[PDB]
Symmetry: C12
């Protein structure tokens, strides 16, 4: 099962889960302060993930650092 690693590079980063299904809305926003890490899966309820703010992101595809 696929997952995303997000490390915040500043205060106030948001990681937002978008709902799986015919409809798409934000179901949760997790706040990260500078240096906090979130390792989040794709799930039965989450089929897309949006990241706002300067962040280091790893997935199976590789890395993107803000």
């Amino acid at each position: 099962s696929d997952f995303v690693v997000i490390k915040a590079l500043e205060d106030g980063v948001n990681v937002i889960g978008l709902t799986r299904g015919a409809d798409t809305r934000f179901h949760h926003s997790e706040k990260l302060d500078k240096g906090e890490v979130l390792i989040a899966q794709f799930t039965e309820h989450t089929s897309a993930i949006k990241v706002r703010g300067k962040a280091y992101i790893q997935t199976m595809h590789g890395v993107i650092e803000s």
Copy 2:
């Protein structure tokens, strides 16, 4: 399931999901402002993804940037 990473390189990038099935229409357009990232799977409802605007994109096949 396969997924795409999109990093917006300018304001107002749109990531659009196209419906799976006999019919094809846009079901959702997620706006991304500069530096924001979307990690989005293909799903039961989305079998094609369209990106408009300056974006850095990674898939299983590699990177596509501009």
Copy 3:
């Protein structure tokens, strides 16, 4: 399932999906303007994809 990445290098690139089944016709053509990207899977309804117009294209086999 397998997918193709198409980036339009001109305006009006057509990504044309062809029907899975005994019959072969286009059921959808998605237009891409210069610099726009489509990542499109093979699916229950699409078993062949045609690209008309100048495009950078990636598949599992390469670019």
Copy 4:
């Protein structure tokens, strides 16, 4: 599921699908003008593919350029 990429290197290339089953006949011919690309799967209805005209062809086995 296996697939073939065909890029036409001249006008009037034909990509022809041959029927799956005990009988073999052409069920469809798709025309490609110079520079047009066809990415076609093997399917429930297509077990062989014939290409006529100068074409660049990729499969899992590698490349043949006319």
Copy 5:
């Protein structure tokens, strides 16, 4: 399913499918003129493929040319 790529290097190459099952006979012969290509799977009906004429052939095992 496994497949074979055949590129005809002269006019009048024949790609022949041999029947799967207790009995073995030719069920189809596809003629290829010079530069024409056939990508052909093994199937429920075809368990051996015969090539006659000058051909460049790729399989999973490699290339065989002349």
Copy 6:
């Protein structure tokens, strides 16, 4: 199933498990003191893990 290796590099590192399902809340926070290690899986109940505090972290994607 997939797992994460967290080594605390300060006292009071919190490894926070978030609920699998429609709702997202923390159901458990495991505290790690400096030098202590937690190897934690994704499971039926945990679909996201947050680490608060300075930590060396390994996943399938790298450190």
Copy 7:
């Protein structure tokens, strides 16, 4: 299923299929003339293949 690639380097190469089962006999011999190619699978009916005559042969193990 596994297959063998035989290219005849003389006239009258015989590719001989032997019966899968308790009994072992040839059920088919396919003749190849010089330069002709047979790509032949193992199947429900063929569990051993014999090549008589000079031939270039590829399998999963090499040439």
Copy 8:
């Protein structure tokens, strides 16, 4: 199933199993004195493992030592 190797580098190292399920508590603490090794799987009952004390640890992800 995935497993962890722990080698104690001092007396009194504890390897603790945390319960799988909605609830999370310690169910067992195995003490390791210097040079002693535990190879421990994740299981139906254990979905997280905690190490306290100076240890050399190997997992699928690599080594972690001190």
Copy 9:
């Protein structure tokens, strides 16, 4: 399904199939003259193969040449 390639390096090579089951006896011996090749599978009826005479043998493990 596993298989053995045998090429005879002299006249009179024998490739012998030993029966699968509680009992073990030779069920067939195939003769190979110099330069003849046998590609033989392990099967429902054959769980061991004996080769007598100077032969070049390939399996998944590699090569043995007499």
Copy 10:
């Protein structure tokens, strides 16, 4: 199915199996004298293995020599 190789580097090494299930206790201790080797699987009854004494240990993760 995963397994551990233990070679004793002194007399009196013990390899101890810990029970699978909600409860954890030692179910068996196998003694190894210097140079004796134990190759032990994880099983329906054993989910953790403890080694006491100077030992060379290999698992899928690599080697630890006392």
Copy 11:
């Protein structure tokens, strides 16, 4: 299923199979004389193998 290759480098090497299950005892010890080889699988009845005596041993993890 997984297997071990034992080559005896002295006379009287014992390859000892231990019972799969709740109980652990030896159910079989196969003696090897110098230079003799045993290739032995893990099975429904054997979940641990002990080698007593000087031996060259290969597993999936190496020698």
Copy 12:
């Protein structure tokens, strides 16, 4: 299924199959004279193979010769 290649390097090599199950006895001994080869699988009836005599042996793990 896994298999072993044995090449006899002297007359009178024996390849012995040991029974699978709760009981262990020899069920078959195949004699190999010099240069003769046996390729033998593990099976429903054979879960250990013993070689006596000078032999070159290949398995999935590598080669063992003398």
